[PDB]
Amino acid sequence: TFKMNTAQKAHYEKFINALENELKTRHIPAGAVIDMLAEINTEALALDYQIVDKKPGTSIAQGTKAAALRKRFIPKKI
Fold this sequence. Notes:
Residues 3-78 form the Factor H binding protein B domain. Keywords: Signal. This is Factor H binding protein B domain-containing protein. It is classed as protein binding. The structure is a monomer. The protein has helices spanning 6-22, 30-45, 66-72; strands at residues 49-53, 73-77. By secondary structure, it is of the alpha+beta class. It has one domain (1-78): Single alpha-helices involved in coiled-coils or other helix-helix interfaces (Helix non-globular), CATH 6.10.250.2300. Strands 1-2 form a two-stranded antiparallel sheet. It is globular and about 30 Å long.
């Protein structure tokens, strides 16, 4: 994330942490992940970056931690 500025990184980390928190108590199905990506990327757009799912069209398992999330949901400057 060395290419990203502080605003982009703050937004991205807020997302990763919130996502980890959601996953404490549930699985998130593939269609919900797609909806989530559109929601967060619409916001990230205003900050000139996007989050890319490296495992697109898949669900996310309960208990998945931030370090794992960061390897799957990768931020890229637009």
